[PDB]
């Protein structure tokens, strides 16, 4: 309906080098300036109110994609939980009703860790897995950036 992507990352005030800058700075800037998509970024676009759970829910419904940025802080704080604790959000993931682009920025070191993630992948009906290879992919006009833009909606 009203957004081309909901953007799900984790920020803490911490296991992240240059990765943090890609997932907090360059990624939303490049998609929303240099390609002009419209993103819903929770730390711009949503006050924590008493209705936060249903606010966040009713914004995912209005988003054409779900981007999930697997910074190691995300695997730390299991950033995906919101999307499995909320009932409607869950079924949307398993029913195909929402397309999930999952930007993988690190190697899943973590025997437990590696397995939870596969049940995430399991539980999403429509999944794209795009791999971020450092500054190398961050360099605009890259192989990562093209891989990402038609996984985004039409123009």
Short mmCIF file of N, CA and C in Angstrom, two decimals:
data_model
loop_
_atom_site.label_atom_id
_atom_site.label_comp_id
_atom_site.label_asym_id
_atom_site.label_seq_id
_atom_site.Cartn_x
_atom_site.Cartn_y
_atom_site.Cartn_z
N UNK A 1 0.82 -1.21 0.00
CA UNK A 1 0.00 0.00 0.00
C UNK A 1 0.86 1.27 0.00
N UNK A 2 1.41 1.69 1.14
CA UNK A 2 2.04 3.01 1.20
C UNK A 2 3.57 3.03 1.32
N UNK A 3 4.25 1.88 1.34
CA UNK A 3 5.71 1.91 1.43
C UNK A 3 6.30 0.79 0.58
N UNK A 4 7.50 1.04 0.07
CA UNK A 4 8.15 0.07 -0.80
C UNK A 4 8.92 -0.96 -0.02
N UNK A 5 9.20 -0.68 1.25
CA UNK A 5 9.91 -1.60 2.12
C UNK A 5 9.78 -1.13 3.56
N UNK A 6 9.60 -2.10 4.47
CA UNK A 6 9.88 -1.95 5.89
C UNK A 6 11.29 -2.44 6.16
N UNK A 7 12.07 -1.62 6.89
CA UNK A 7 13.50 -1.83 7.10
C UNK A 7 13.76 -2.27 8.54
N UNK A 8 14.20 -3.52 8.72
CA UNK A 8 14.39 -4.12 10.04
C UNK A 8 15.88 -4.38 10.26
N UNK A 9 16.50 -3.59 11.13
CA UNK A 9 17.88 -3.83 11.53
C UNK A 9 17.95 -3.80 13.05
N UNK A 10 19.15 -3.96 13.63
CA UNK A 10 19.30 -3.69 15.05
C UNK A 10 20.44 -2.72 15.27
N UNK A 11 20.21 -1.77 16.17
CA UNK A 11 21.22 -0.81 16.59
C UNK A 11 21.34 -0.87 18.10
N UNK A 12 22.57 -0.89 18.61
CA UNK A 12 22.80 -0.86 20.04
C UNK A 12 23.79 0.27 20.33
N UNK A 13 23.75 0.79 21.55
CA UNK A 13 24.59 1.94 21.95
C UNK A 13 25.67 1.59 22.99
N UNK A 14 28.01 -4.48 21.59
CA UNK A 14 27.93 -4.04 20.20
C UNK A 14 29.01 -4.67 19.35
N UNK A 15 28.61 -5.58 18.47
CA UNK A 15 29.52 -6.30 17.57
C UNK A 15 29.20 -5.83 16.15
N UNK A 16 29.97 -4.84 15.64
CA UNK A 16 29.78 -4.22 14.32
C UNK A 16 30.94 -3.30 13.91
N UNK A 17 31.62 -3.57 12.76
CA UNK A 17 32.60 -2.59 12.23
C UNK A 17 32.00 -1.62 11.22
N UNK A 18 32.58 -1.57 10.01
CA UNK A 18 31.99 -0.86 8.87
C UNK A 18 30.58 -1.34 8.55
N UNK A 19 30.23 -2.55 9.00
CA UNK A 19 28.90 -3.11 8.76
C UNK A 19 27.80 -2.19 9.27
N UNK A 20 27.93 -1.74 10.52
CA UNK A 20 27.00 -0.75 11.07
C UNK A 20 26.70 0.39 10.10
N UNK A 21 27.74 1.00 9.53
CA UNK A 21 27.51 2.11 8.61
C UNK A 21 26.73 1.66 7.37
N UNK A 22 27.01 0.46 6.85
CA UNK A 22 26.23 0.02 5.69
C UNK A 22 24.75 -0.11 6.05
N UNK A 23 24.45 -0.74 7.18
CA UNK A 23 23.07 -1.01 7.55
C UNK A 23 22.35 0.17 8.16
N UNK A 24 23.08 1.14 8.70
CA UNK A 24 22.41 2.31 9.25
C UNK A 24 22.47 3.50 8.34
N UNK A 25 23.57 3.68 7.62
CA UNK A 25 23.75 4.84 6.77
C UNK A 25 23.52 4.48 5.30
N UNK A 26 24.45 3.76 4.68
CA UNK A 26 24.51 3.79 3.23
C UNK A 26 23.30 3.08 2.63
N UNK A 27 22.83 1.98 3.26
CA UNK A 27 21.78 1.19 2.66
C UNK A 27 20.46 1.98 2.53
N UNK A 28 19.98 2.63 3.60
CA UNK A 28 18.73 3.40 3.41
C UNK A 28 18.93 4.64 2.58
N UNK A 29 20.13 5.21 2.59
CA UNK A 29 20.36 6.39 1.77
C UNK A 29 20.36 6.00 0.29
N UNK A 30 21.10 4.94 -0.06
CA UNK A 30 21.18 4.56 -1.47
C UNK A 30 19.83 4.10 -2.02
N UNK A 31 19.02 3.40 -1.22
CA UNK A 31 17.71 2.98 -1.74
C UNK A 31 16.70 4.12 -1.81
N UNK A 32 16.91 5.19 -1.06
CA UNK A 32 15.84 6.15 -0.90
C UNK A 32 16.18 7.50 -1.52
N UNK A 33 17.43 7.69 -1.94
CA UNK A 33 17.93 8.88 -2.61
C UNK A 33 18.34 8.56 -4.04
N UNK A 34 19.35 7.70 -4.18
CA UNK A 34 19.94 7.36 -5.46
C UNK A 34 19.09 6.39 -6.28
N UNK A 35 18.06 5.76 -5.68
CA UNK A 35 17.06 5.01 -6.43
C UNK A 35 15.64 5.47 -6.13
N UNK A 36 15.44 6.28 -5.09
CA UNK A 36 14.13 6.86 -4.86
C UNK A 36 13.02 5.95 -4.35
N UNK A 37 13.33 4.79 -3.76
CA UNK A 37 12.25 4.06 -3.13
C UNK A 37 11.84 4.75 -1.82
N UNK A 38 10.64 4.46 -1.33
CA UNK A 38 10.14 5.02 -0.07
C UNK A 38 10.18 3.95 1.05
N UNK A 39 10.99 4.19 2.09
CA UNK A 39 11.22 3.22 3.15
C UNK A 39 10.55 3.65 4.45
N UNK A 40 10.12 2.66 5.23
CA UNK A 40 9.63 2.87 6.59
C UNK A 40 10.72 2.39 7.56
N UNK A 41 11.37 3.34 8.23
CA UNK A 41 12.50 3.07 9.08
C UNK A 41 12.01 3.30 10.52
N UNK A 42 11.91 2.27 11.37
CA UNK A 42 11.24 2.48 12.66
C UNK A 42 11.81 3.62 13.51
N UNK A 43 13.12 3.89 13.45
CA UNK A 43 13.63 4.97 14.28
C UNK A 43 13.50 6.38 13.67
N UNK A 44 12.97 6.56 12.44
CA UNK A 44 12.34 7.81 11.97
C UNK A 44 10.84 7.84 12.22
N UNK A 45 10.18 6.75 11.91
CA UNK A 45 8.82 6.81 11.42
C UNK A 45 7.83 6.27 12.44
N UNK A 46 8.29 6.00 13.67
CA UNK A 46 7.40 5.44 14.69
C UNK A 46 7.98 5.75 16.06
N UNK A 47 7.33 6.69 16.74
CA UNK A 47 7.26 6.83 18.20
C UNK A 47 6.99 5.49 18.88
N UNK A 48 7.67 5.16 19.96
CA UNK A 48 7.15 4.10 20.83
C UNK A 48 5.96 4.56 21.67
N UNK A 49 4.75 4.24 21.23
CA UNK A 49 3.53 4.56 21.96
C UNK A 49 3.01 3.31 22.67
N UNK A 50 1.88 3.47 23.36
CA UNK A 50 1.21 2.32 23.96
C UNK A 50 0.70 1.34 22.93
N UNK A 51 0.49 1.81 21.70
CA UNK A 51 -0.03 1.04 20.59
C UNK A 51 1.09 0.58 19.65
N UNK A 52 2.32 0.57 20.15
CA UNK A 52 3.50 0.29 19.33
C UNK A 52 3.37 -1.04 18.60
N UNK A 53 3.04 -2.11 19.32
CA UNK A 53 2.88 -3.42 18.69
C UNK A 53 1.87 -3.38 17.54
N UNK A 54 0.71 -2.77 17.75
CA UNK A 54 -0.23 -2.71 16.65
C UNK A 54 0.15 -1.63 15.64
N UNK A 55 0.88 -0.60 16.07
CA UNK A 55 1.39 0.37 15.10
C UNK A 55 2.36 -0.31 14.15
N UNK A 56 3.43 -0.88 14.70
CA UNK A 56 4.39 -1.61 13.88
C UNK A 56 3.71 -2.66 13.01
N UNK A 57 2.71 -3.36 13.55
CA UNK A 57 2.00 -4.36 12.76
C UNK A 57 1.34 -3.73 11.54
N UNK A 58 0.59 -2.65 11.75
CA UNK A 58 -0.19 -2.07 10.67
C UNK A 58 0.67 -1.29 9.67
N UNK A 59 1.97 -1.15 9.93
CA UNK A 59 2.95 -0.62 8.98
C UNK A 59 3.57 -1.71 8.12
N UNK A 60 3.79 -2.90 8.69
CA UNK A 60 4.24 -4.03 7.89
C UNK A 60 3.21 -4.38 6.84
N UNK A 61 1.92 -4.36 7.22
CA UNK A 61 0.86 -4.64 6.25
C UNK A 61 0.91 -3.67 5.08
N UNK A 62 1.21 -2.40 5.34
CA UNK A 62 1.29 -1.41 4.27
C UNK A 62 2.63 -1.40 3.54
N UNK A 63 3.52 -2.36 3.76
CA UNK A 63 4.83 -2.33 3.13
C UNK A 63 4.90 -3.41 2.06
N UNK A 64 5.48 -3.06 0.92
CA UNK A 64 5.56 -4.01 -0.18
C UNK A 64 6.67 -5.03 0.01
N UNK A 65 7.74 -4.68 0.72
CA UNK A 65 8.79 -5.63 1.06
C UNK A 65 9.11 -5.53 2.54
N UNK A 66 9.74 -6.58 3.06
CA UNK A 66 10.38 -6.58 4.37
C UNK A 66 11.87 -6.81 4.14
N UNK A 67 12.69 -5.81 4.47
CA UNK A 67 14.13 -5.99 4.43
C UNK A 67 14.61 -6.26 5.85
N UNK A 68 15.44 -7.29 5.98
CA UNK A 68 15.98 -7.78 7.24
C UNK A 68 17.50 -7.78 7.10
N UNK A 69 18.19 -6.97 7.90
CA UNK A 69 19.61 -6.71 7.69
C UNK A 69 20.35 -7.45 8.79
N UNK A 70 20.91 -8.62 8.46
CA UNK A 70 21.56 -9.52 9.41
C UNK A 70 22.97 -9.07 9.81
N UNK A 71 23.05 -7.84 10.32
CA UNK A 71 24.15 -7.43 11.19
C UNK A 71 24.27 -8.40 12.37
N UNK A 72 25.49 -8.65 12.90
CA UNK A 72 25.60 -9.56 14.06
C UNK A 72 24.84 -9.07 15.27
N UNK A 73 24.69 -7.75 15.44
CA UNK A 73 23.77 -7.24 16.46
C UNK A 73 22.35 -7.76 16.29
N UNK A 74 21.90 -7.97 15.06
CA UNK A 74 20.58 -8.52 14.84
C UNK A 74 20.48 -9.96 15.35
N UNK A 75 21.50 -10.77 15.08
CA UNK A 75 21.47 -12.15 15.58
C UNK A 75 21.60 -12.15 17.09
N UNK A 76 22.40 -11.23 17.63
CA UNK A 76 22.42 -11.00 19.07
C UNK A 76 21.01 -10.80 19.61
N UNK A 77 20.34 -9.71 19.23
CA UNK A 77 19.08 -9.33 19.85
C UNK A 77 17.89 -10.07 19.29
N UNK A 78 18.13 -11.19 18.60
CA UNK A 78 17.19 -11.84 17.69
C UNK A 78 16.14 -10.89 17.13
N UNK A 79 16.57 -9.97 16.26
CA UNK A 79 15.73 -8.92 15.72
C UNK A 79 14.46 -9.39 15.07
N UNK A 80 14.38 -10.67 14.67
CA UNK A 80 13.22 -11.19 13.96
C UNK A 80 12.02 -11.46 14.86
N UNK A 81 12.16 -11.37 16.19
CA UNK A 81 11.14 -11.91 17.08
C UNK A 81 9.79 -11.25 16.88
N UNK A 82 9.78 -9.92 16.72
CA UNK A 82 8.55 -9.17 16.48
C UNK A 82 7.72 -9.84 15.40
N UNK A 83 8.37 -10.33 14.36
CA UNK A 83 7.65 -10.91 13.24
C UNK A 83 7.18 -12.33 13.50
N UNK A 84 7.50 -12.92 14.64
CA UNK A 84 6.95 -14.21 14.98
C UNK A 84 6.11 -14.18 16.23
N UNK A 85 6.25 -13.15 17.05
CA UNK A 85 5.40 -12.99 18.22
C UNK A 85 4.03 -12.46 17.83
N UNK A 86 3.97 -11.50 16.90
CA UNK A 86 2.70 -11.00 16.39
C UNK A 86 2.07 -12.03 15.46
N UNK A 87 0.83 -12.39 15.76
CA UNK A 87 0.17 -13.46 15.01
C UNK A 87 0.07 -13.10 13.53
N UNK A 88 -0.55 -11.97 13.21
CA UNK A 88 -0.79 -11.61 11.81
C UNK A 88 0.51 -11.56 11.02
N UNK A 89 1.54 -10.92 11.58
CA UNK A 89 2.85 -10.89 10.93
C UNK A 89 3.39 -12.28 10.64
N UNK A 90 3.18 -13.23 11.55
CA UNK A 90 3.69 -14.57 11.30
C UNK A 90 3.06 -15.15 10.04
N UNK A 91 1.72 -15.25 10.03
CA UNK A 91 1.05 -15.90 8.92
C UNK A 91 1.39 -15.21 7.59
N UNK A 92 1.45 -13.87 7.59
CA UNK A 92 1.97 -13.16 6.42
C UNK A 92 3.34 -13.65 5.95
N UNK A 93 4.22 -14.04 6.88
CA UNK A 93 5.51 -14.56 6.45
C UNK A 93 5.38 -15.97 5.88
N UNK A 94 4.60 -16.83 6.55
CA UNK A 94 4.51 -18.21 6.11
C UNK A 94 3.55 -18.39 4.94
N UNK A 95 2.55 -17.52 4.78
CA UNK A 95 1.59 -17.62 3.69
C UNK A 95 2.08 -17.00 2.37
N UNK A 96 3.26 -16.40 2.35
CA UNK A 96 3.69 -15.69 1.17
C UNK A 96 3.15 -14.29 1.04
N UNK A 97 2.27 -13.85 1.94
CA UNK A 97 1.63 -12.53 1.81
C UNK A 97 2.60 -11.35 1.89
N UNK A 98 3.86 -11.57 2.25
CA UNK A 98 4.87 -10.51 2.27
C UNK A 98 6.19 -11.07 1.77
N UNK A 99 6.85 -10.34 0.88
CA UNK A 99 8.12 -10.77 0.32
C UNK A 99 9.25 -10.28 1.23
N UNK A 100 10.13 -11.18 1.64
CA UNK A 100 11.20 -10.88 2.58
C UNK A 100 12.51 -10.87 1.81
N UNK A 101 13.19 -9.73 1.80
CA UNK A 101 14.57 -9.67 1.33
C UNK A 101 15.44 -9.66 2.57
N UNK A 102 16.38 -10.62 2.65
CA UNK A 102 17.25 -10.83 3.81
C UNK A 102 18.69 -10.58 3.37
N UNK A 103 19.24 -9.43 3.77
CA UNK A 103 20.60 -9.02 3.41
C UNK A 103 21.57 -9.61 4.42
N UNK A 104 22.37 -10.57 4.00
CA UNK A 104 23.25 -11.28 4.94
C UNK A 104 24.61 -10.58 4.95
N UNK A 105 24.95 -9.94 6.08
CA UNK A 105 26.20 -9.19 6.17
C UNK A 105 27.34 -9.92 6.89
N UNK A 106 27.12 -11.09 7.48
CA UNK A 106 28.19 -11.77 8.19
C UNK A 106 28.07 -13.27 8.01
N UNK A 107 29.13 -13.97 8.44
CA UNK A 107 29.16 -15.43 8.46
C UNK A 107 28.52 -15.92 9.75
N UNK A 108 27.54 -16.82 9.62
CA UNK A 108 26.81 -17.32 10.79
C UNK A 108 27.69 -18.30 11.56
N UNK A 109 28.67 -17.73 12.28
CA UNK A 109 29.36 -18.44 13.35
C UNK A 109 28.39 -18.58 14.52
N UNK A 110 28.11 -19.81 14.92
CA UNK A 110 27.08 -20.00 15.93
C UNK A 110 26.27 -21.24 15.64
N UNK A 111 26.58 -22.29 16.38
CA UNK A 111 25.97 -23.59 16.15
C UNK A 111 24.47 -23.52 16.41
N UNK A 112 24.09 -23.07 17.62
CA UNK A 112 22.71 -22.63 17.87
C UNK A 112 22.31 -21.58 16.85
N UNK A 113 23.09 -20.50 16.76
CA UNK A 113 22.72 -19.37 15.91
C UNK A 113 22.36 -19.84 14.51
N UNK A 114 23.21 -20.67 13.90
CA UNK A 114 22.99 -21.06 12.52
C UNK A 114 21.64 -21.77 12.33
N UNK A 115 21.13 -22.41 13.38
CA UNK A 115 19.93 -23.22 13.30
C UNK A 115 18.64 -22.42 13.48
N UNK A 116 18.62 -21.48 14.43
CA UNK A 116 17.49 -20.57 14.53
C UNK A 116 17.23 -19.89 13.19
N UNK A 117 18.31 -19.36 12.59
CA UNK A 117 18.22 -18.67 11.31
C UNK A 117 17.55 -19.54 10.26
N UNK A 118 17.91 -20.83 10.18
CA UNK A 118 17.25 -21.69 9.20
C UNK A 118 15.77 -21.89 9.50
N UNK A 119 15.36 -21.86 10.77
CA UNK A 119 13.92 -21.89 10.97
C UNK A 119 13.29 -20.56 10.60
N UNK A 120 14.04 -19.46 10.64
CA UNK A 120 13.54 -18.23 10.04
C UNK A 120 13.32 -18.44 8.56
N UNK A 121 14.36 -18.92 7.88
CA UNK A 121 14.27 -19.13 6.44
C UNK A 121 13.16 -20.13 6.11
N UNK A 122 13.16 -21.28 6.78
CA UNK A 122 12.02 -22.20 6.81
C UNK A 122 10.70 -21.45 6.82
N UNK A 123 10.46 -20.67 7.87
CA UNK A 123 9.16 -20.08 8.16
C UNK A 123 8.74 -18.94 7.24
N UNK A 124 9.63 -18.41 6.39
CA UNK A 124 9.25 -17.40 5.39
C UNK A 124 8.93 -18.09 4.06
N UNK A 125 7.71 -17.90 3.57
CA UNK A 125 7.33 -18.54 2.32
C UNK A 125 8.12 -17.98 1.14
N UNK A 126 8.20 -16.66 1.02
CA UNK A 126 8.82 -16.03 -0.15
C UNK A 126 10.10 -15.29 0.27
N UNK A 127 11.26 -15.93 0.11
CA UNK A 127 12.52 -15.40 0.63
C UNK A 127 13.55 -15.18 -0.47
N UNK A 128 14.21 -14.01 -0.44
CA UNK A 128 15.41 -13.74 -1.22
C UNK A 128 16.58 -13.53 -0.27
N UNK A 129 17.69 -14.20 -0.54
CA UNK A 129 18.87 -14.10 0.31
C UNK A 129 19.98 -13.43 -0.49
N UNK A 130 20.32 -12.19 -0.14
CA UNK A 130 21.32 -11.40 -0.84
C UNK A 130 22.51 -11.21 0.10
N UNK A 131 23.72 -11.45 -0.42
CA UNK A 131 24.94 -11.49 0.37
C UNK A 131 25.74 -10.19 0.22
N UNK A 132 26.10 -9.58 1.36
CA UNK A 132 26.87 -8.33 1.41
C UNK A 132 28.33 -8.65 1.68
N UNK A 133 29.20 -8.27 0.75
CA UNK A 133 30.58 -8.72 0.78
C UNK A 133 31.55 -7.64 1.25
N UNK A 134 31.08 -6.63 1.98
CA UNK A 134 31.98 -5.59 2.46
C UNK A 134 31.86 -4.25 1.75
N UNK A 135 32.93 -3.44 1.76
CA UNK A 135 32.97 -2.24 0.92
C UNK A 135 32.79 -2.60 -0.55
N UNK A 136 33.14 -3.85 -0.89
CA UNK A 136 33.15 -4.33 -2.26
C UNK A 136 31.74 -4.25 -2.86
N UNK A 137 30.74 -4.74 -2.11
CA UNK A 137 29.34 -4.59 -2.48
C UNK A 137 28.82 -3.18 -2.22
N UNK A 138 29.33 -2.52 -1.18
CA UNK A 138 28.84 -1.19 -0.89
C UNK A 138 29.17 -0.26 -2.02
N UNK A 139 30.27 -0.50 -2.73
CA UNK A 139 30.59 0.32 -3.88
C UNK A 139 29.42 0.31 -4.85
N UNK A 140 28.85 1.49 -5.05
CA UNK A 140 27.70 1.66 -5.93
C UNK A 140 28.00 1.16 -7.34
N UNK A 141 26.91 0.90 -8.07
CA UNK A 141 26.93 0.08 -9.28
C UNK A 141 27.63 -1.25 -9.04
N UNK A 142 27.24 -1.93 -7.98
CA UNK A 142 27.85 -3.22 -7.76
C UNK A 142 26.93 -4.34 -8.18
N UNK A 143 27.46 -5.54 -7.99
CA UNK A 143 26.78 -6.80 -8.15
C UNK A 143 25.75 -7.04 -7.04
N UNK A 144 26.00 -6.52 -5.84
CA UNK A 144 25.00 -6.59 -4.78
C UNK A 144 23.85 -5.62 -5.04
N UNK A 145 24.16 -4.42 -5.49
CA UNK A 145 23.12 -3.41 -5.61
C UNK A 145 22.11 -3.77 -6.70
N UNK A 146 22.56 -4.36 -7.81
CA UNK A 146 21.61 -4.81 -8.83
C UNK A 146 20.79 -5.96 -8.30
N UNK A 147 21.45 -6.93 -7.69
CA UNK A 147 20.76 -8.05 -7.10
C UNK A 147 19.61 -7.56 -6.23
N UNK A 148 19.78 -6.39 -5.61
CA UNK A 148 18.80 -5.89 -4.65
C UNK A 148 17.67 -5.07 -5.28
N UNK A 149 17.91 -4.39 -6.40
CA UNK A 149 16.93 -3.42 -6.85
C UNK A 149 15.73 -4.01 -7.58
N UNK A 150 15.85 -5.17 -8.21
CA UNK A 150 14.62 -5.72 -8.78
C UNK A 150 13.96 -6.66 -7.82
N UNK A 151 14.65 -6.99 -6.73
CA UNK A 151 13.95 -7.59 -5.61
C UNK A 151 13.14 -6.55 -4.88
N UNK A 152 13.41 -5.27 -5.13
CA UNK A 152 12.57 -4.17 -4.68
C UNK A 152 11.41 -4.04 -5.65
N UNK A 153 10.36 -3.30 -5.30
CA UNK A 153 9.22 -3.18 -6.21
C UNK A 153 9.59 -2.42 -7.48
N UNK A 154 8.69 -2.54 -8.44
CA UNK A 154 8.66 -1.74 -9.67
C UNK A 154 8.86 -0.24 -9.46
N UNK A 155 9.95 0.29 -10.03
CA UNK A 155 10.33 1.72 -10.04
C UNK A 155 9.95 2.56 -8.81
#
